Amino acid sequence: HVSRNKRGQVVGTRGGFRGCTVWLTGLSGAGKTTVSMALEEYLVCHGIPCYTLDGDNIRQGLNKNLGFSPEDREENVRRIAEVAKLFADAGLVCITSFISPYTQDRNNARQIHEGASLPFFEVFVDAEYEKPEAPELVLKTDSCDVNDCVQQVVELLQERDIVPVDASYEVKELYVPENKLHLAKTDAETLPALKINKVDMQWVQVLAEGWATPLNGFMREREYLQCLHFDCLLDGGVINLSVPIVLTATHEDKERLDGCTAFALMYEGRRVAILRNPEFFEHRKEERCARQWGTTCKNHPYIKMVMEQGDWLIGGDLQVLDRVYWNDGLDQYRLTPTELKQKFKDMNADAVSAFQLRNPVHNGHALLMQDTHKQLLERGYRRPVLLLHPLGGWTKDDDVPLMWRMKQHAAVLEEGVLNPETTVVAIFPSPMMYAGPTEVQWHCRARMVAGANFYIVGRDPAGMPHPETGKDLYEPSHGAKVLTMAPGLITLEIVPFRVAAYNKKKKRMDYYDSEHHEDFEFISGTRMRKLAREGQKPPEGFMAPKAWTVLTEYYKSLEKAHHH
Amino acid sequence: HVSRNKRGQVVGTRGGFRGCTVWLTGLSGAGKTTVSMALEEYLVCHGIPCYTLDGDNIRQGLNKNLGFSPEDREENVRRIAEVAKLFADAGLVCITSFISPYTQDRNNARQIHEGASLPFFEVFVDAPLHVCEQRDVKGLYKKARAGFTGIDSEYEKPEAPELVLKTDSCDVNDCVQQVVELLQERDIVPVDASYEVKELYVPENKLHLAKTDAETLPALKINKVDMQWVQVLAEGWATPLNGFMREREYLQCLHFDCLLDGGVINLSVPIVLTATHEDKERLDGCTAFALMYEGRRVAILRNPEFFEHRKEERCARQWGTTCKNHPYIKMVMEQGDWLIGGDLQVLDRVYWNDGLDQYRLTPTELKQKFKDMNADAVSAFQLRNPVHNGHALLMQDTHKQLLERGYRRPVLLLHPLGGWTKDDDVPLMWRMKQHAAVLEEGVLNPETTVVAIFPSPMMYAGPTEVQWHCRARMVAGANFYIVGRDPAGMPHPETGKDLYEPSHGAKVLTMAPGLITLEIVPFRVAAYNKKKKRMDYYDSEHHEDFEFISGTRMRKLAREGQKPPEGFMAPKAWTVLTEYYKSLEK
Numbered sequence A: 001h002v003s004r005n006k007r008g009q010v011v012g013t014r015g016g017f018r019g020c021t022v023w024l025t026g027l028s029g030a031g032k033t034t035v036s037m038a039l040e041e042y043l044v045c046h047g048i049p050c051y052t053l054d055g056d057n058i059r060q061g062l063n064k065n066l067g068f069s070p071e072d073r074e075e076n077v078r079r080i081a082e083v084a085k086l087f088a089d090a091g092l093v094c095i096t097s098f099i100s101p102y103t104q105d106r107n108n109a110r111q112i113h114e115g116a117s118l119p120f121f122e123v124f125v126d127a128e129y130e131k132p133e134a135p136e137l138v139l140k141t142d143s144c145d146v147n148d149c150v151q152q153v154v155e156l157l158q159e160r161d162i163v164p165v166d167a168s169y170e171v172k173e174l175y176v177p178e179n180k181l182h183l184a185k186t187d188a189e190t191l192p193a194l195k196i197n198k199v200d201m202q203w204v205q206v207l208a209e210g211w212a213t214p215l216n217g218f219m220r221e222r223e224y225l226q227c228l229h230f231d232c233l234l235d236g237g238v239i240n241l242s243v244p245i246v247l248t249a250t251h252e253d254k255e256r257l258d259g260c261t262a263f264a265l266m267y268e269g270r271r272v273a274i275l276r277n278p279e280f281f282e283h284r285k286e287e288r289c290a291r292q293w294g295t296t297c298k299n300h301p302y303i304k305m306v307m308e309q310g311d312w313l314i315g316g317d318l319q320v321l322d323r324v325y326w327n328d329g330l331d332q333y334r335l336t337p338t339e340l341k342q343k344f345k346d347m348n349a350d351a352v353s354a355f356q357l358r359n360p361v362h363n364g365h366a367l368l369m370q371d372t373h374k375q376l377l378e379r380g381y382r383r384p385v386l387l388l389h390p391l392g393g394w395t396k397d398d399d400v401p402l403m404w405r406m407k408q409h410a411a412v413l414e415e416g417v418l419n420p421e422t423t424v425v426a427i428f429p430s431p432m433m434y435a436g437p438t439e440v441q442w443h444c445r446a447r448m449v450a451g452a453n454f455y456i457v458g459r460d461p462a463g464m465p466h467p468e469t470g471k472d473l474y475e476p477s478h479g480a481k482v483l484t485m486a487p488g489l490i491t492l493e494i495v496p497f498r499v500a501a502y503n504k505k506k507k508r509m510d511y512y513d514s515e516h517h518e519d520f521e522f523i524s525g526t527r528m529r530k531l532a533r534e535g536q537k538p539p540e541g542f543m544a545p546k547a548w549t550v551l552t553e554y555y556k557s558l559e560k561a562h563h564h
Numbered sequence B: 001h002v003s004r005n006k007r008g009q010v011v012g013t014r015g016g017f018r019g020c021t022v023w024l025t026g027l028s029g030a031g032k033t034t035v036s037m038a039l040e041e042y043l044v045c046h047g048i049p050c051y052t053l054d055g056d057n058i059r060q061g062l063n064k065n066l067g068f069s070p071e072d073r074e075e076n077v078r079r080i081a082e083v084a085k086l087f088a089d090a091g092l093v094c095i096t097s098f099i100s101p102y103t104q105d106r107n108n109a110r111q112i113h114e115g116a117s118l119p120f121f122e123v124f125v126d127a128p129l130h131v132c133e134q135r136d137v138k139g140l141y142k143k144a145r146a147g148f149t150g151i152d153s154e155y156e157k158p159e160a161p162e163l164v165l166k167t168d169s170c171d172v173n174d175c176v177q178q179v180v181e182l183l184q185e186r187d188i189v190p191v192d193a194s195y196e197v198k199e200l201y202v203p204e205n206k207l208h209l210a211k212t213d214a215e216t217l218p219a220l221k222i223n224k225v226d227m228q229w230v231q232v233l234a235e236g237w238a239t240p241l242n243g244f245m246r247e248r249e250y251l252q253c254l255h256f257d258c259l260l261d262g263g264v265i266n267l268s269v270p271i272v273l274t275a276t277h278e279d280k281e282r283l284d285g286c287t288a289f290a291l292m293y294e295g296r297r298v299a300i301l302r303n304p305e306f307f308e309h310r311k312e313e314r315c316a317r318q319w320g321t322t323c324k325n326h327p328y329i330k331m332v333m334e335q336g337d338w339l340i341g342g343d344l345q346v347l348d349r350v351y352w353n354d355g356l357d358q359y360r361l362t363p364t365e366l367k368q369k370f371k372d373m374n375a376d377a378v379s380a381f382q383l384r385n386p387v388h389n390g391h392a393l394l395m396q397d398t399h400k401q402l403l404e405r406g407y408r409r410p411v412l413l414l415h416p417l418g419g420w421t422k423d424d425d426v427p428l429m430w431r432m433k434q435h436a437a438v439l440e441e442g443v444l445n446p447e448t449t450v451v452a453i454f455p456s457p458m459m460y461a462g463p464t465e466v467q468w469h470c471r472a473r474m475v476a477g478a479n480f481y482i483v484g485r486d487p488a489g490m491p492h493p494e495t496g497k498d499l500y501e502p503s504h505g506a507k508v509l510t511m512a513p514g515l516i517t518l519e520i521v522p523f524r525v526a527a528y529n530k531k532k533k534r535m536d537y538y539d540s541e542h543h544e545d546f547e548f549i550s551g552t553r554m555r556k557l558a559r560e561g562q563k564p565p566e567g568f569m570a571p572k573a574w575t576v577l578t579e580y581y582k583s584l585e586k
């Protein structure tokens, strides 16, 4: 037969052999049944195949020829224990729910398993029964609600390496350990230096914090090519990475540095990282832009930056020094993927849904977030958390600045449109590229690294008007169509939505409908700015009032940037 | 409890509930253990969780309290059937391996399953009793001869099994393949995407009928490049496409260079049919229409779908430029704003009647040719220019490498492209005459060379196109794909610089997904070495030793009545080009 290890690797979606038996015991019928069913739902919800043995599938099948004689009851428990063992051997978490009153029979069931090196967890649901003398768990089901009870079981299974403690992709930070920093800064001081700009420093941050795991630094030619042609890294496994994470260089700088085994990156006169074992390769700007954006339009605001950069790229192993902070009053929201994962744990989340943003949050956005939350509750998640995740790297000139967005978002939560108790507000450090279906994959994969389990996507993600025509640069359905089928995003689920707009009839935000076109008022950023300058407000229900007020303040400051 | 649909979604990596029981039955020694183990291994290897119930886990555990009385034997099988049903309900493929001699016992096991809406497949592992005794795999038969079903008890043959395996007339692969094909027919095992040649021609015995059908349909007129794409699909070069790309396939192609549904398949160039707003409105809603070339109905497109031809974006992603003066891009920019995907049934076999159809072999014809030559390796060389001795050097050195590895009959597929090419390229007829001359001179050996024309339009899309060139030759049975510098490249129409970095084609090919049955054989540029007086691999140090002879230079030599240096091109092949150049100047 195939080994447990091989059988393990195909059983579930999660990898590793985790066969075992969770053996409930105790008088309480409702207590065992509520715990077994809730545990089963939890396991299935977290990608772990399981199967329950109870009265409803054993009594009238395998044990249909057994009655209430002492010998028949003994045989009843024996048969159940042997079948539980076969499920555990198969790689499933087998849950059994029978009173199983006698120590002898339970101890025998245990030996059937431990004898075959299969974990056995005796769980006493405590509400001529013989109490277990050393159960792995005691559940006081009359005094603790079902969800606490199930959490006690999940914790045991985590303890015993059955349920993964954290089943997102391991984050690879590129920061030097803090006890090695002073030495690493001293080392950096002896190296040649290459001055970088602010956008470059933001990409240093993206790498440092692990958002581009498993990169070891700025992309080498091999990674750059896999990215541009396939939207994935390929070496050692397929993982989505659809945008170049590169450092540019002029011909002059390449000539100065090619040959060095290491150099420092310098931002605002400070040495912020070391690049080791560098490799210099051609940028090829037109080809990059065409493949990455689906256009080479010179007035696209990110492409404009790329076009002014040098003709070389430098790949290498990046060691970033001092933790990157910007000291602008928003560092409190700049959580790393590791910090986000600890936050979700502290909140006891059992699902994390992520929402990428570069604009003010209106109640159309909120609709997608609210309906996601409802969908997760209905699927069996008990404590879903929303990761409201505005982007905070470079953005284009007419976007609403980050500080104003963060103030607006704070007003939306203050008004209760989103619940602050089940929402984490954090800033994603990447520059924004405005590359539509190519970029949405990057936005999604970054959140995956940070432990998101569900990624919300709507219409025209990461898009903008074509600078020459004013028509949409990208077809507005493509971002969700591409993301739903994109390779290398296996630890999360994409949750796609139709566009939401203000429905004049219902006086609220709702999903757009082809028939009923005229019932819908679409309100853009341009239109918001126009309304504000004439002292008007969008329709009631489009945006939380306090959050609209923040925007009037922004628009007033823009107007100021006079007769009296 | 959680439903079957939901528990199924987390059982394994493939979507969908596929719980069921595969119930082997037959005489001791007929082959049940052997089949079950080999079936188990197949399933695990293809990502499908399964579990086997046999003597090694049932007998000494659950059934340890059962002996040999008839009542106990009946209980043995009843308990195994109940356990199997639990495994199948759990979403596993449960395989059972027990003699299970009695019809009533096996019928009861079936009924337990079918009553709970779980599929049950009764597989009769059928070998003659004398054969099973002959094998006597565990020594049970000669132990029964001295003091058992088939001897002192009866075996009752299944009356309507789902499958019968005649193990004395087939091998283990035959058994596993029969079981797997049943599980595929019954939607338990998915049929994964394959490179096995898939022609879209209608079978000859159905053609007249299909032509009749086509006449009743609305029609769309296509151009010659589109007809060449029809030929590419018809012959199977774009296997496993079922027709012109639907939106889902087009988006996969553009963003990922791969089709992904059912497995990773390399397909890096759109294979699409275009249409105007007017044709879209005429045809949208129809369930099938005919494609017309030169007034003939050449194909039916069934169940079509219309989606936007975002031309700027397509061109940018496919070519890595939107330059309007790129000669293929120029054609794309003149097409309609819609694409039409669908299932393509191609009618009469495509021939061009230009004196070169003898070279226009299909992938199936090519594989038959290699078989007839008893080749044990095939290397392929894609060309769009005349063959000089620099190309021959790559070919000859590949043949050497294959002999050194131990292949005994390596065959070269010299495979010029014959679909649309840009205006200043040497026309196909002249190239084919020129290639014939190279073989006549013995620069390449005619006895170990297949010359054939690849029907694809040429796109001049560099590292994106070279994947298409390579995968197309893989489908036609190439085991080795020869690649040089700047494959499928050309100069930028505006700047004059190379469009592509010359090493990227080879670099991309060596890591491209889906290129599973061939090896890439990469080479440096080969040029005329003046010092050594022959074609040789270019070297930076020693740059002054090399004469590059371009198309431009050859035209000039021909004009002035001169020849390239000795050893650059076989003399008779050069003469063919002097005839070409003569007509060109006119």
Ligand SMILES: Nc1ncnc2c1ncn2[C@@H]1O[C@H](COP(=O)(O)OP(=O)(O)O)[C@@H](O)[C@H]1O
Pocket (backbone or CB within 6 Å): B026, B027, B028, B029, B030, B031, B032, B033, B034, B035, B097, B125, B135, B137, B166, B167, B168, B170, B171, B172, B175
């Ligand atoms: N096509 C075949 N399928 C299965 N076994 C075969 C086949 N052909 C020959 N055999 C041989 O027949 C014997 C079957 O033994 P086994 O599988 O243990 O029988 P069973 O489990 O029915 O008692 C093996 O030695 C096997 O190699």
Ligand SMILES: [Cl-]
Pocket (backbone or CB within 6 Å): A356, A357, A358, A461, A462, A463
């Ligand atoms: Cl966005």
Ligand SMILES: [Cl-]
Pocket (backbone or CB within 6 Å): B382, B383, B384, B487, B488, B489
């Ligand atoms: Cl070529």
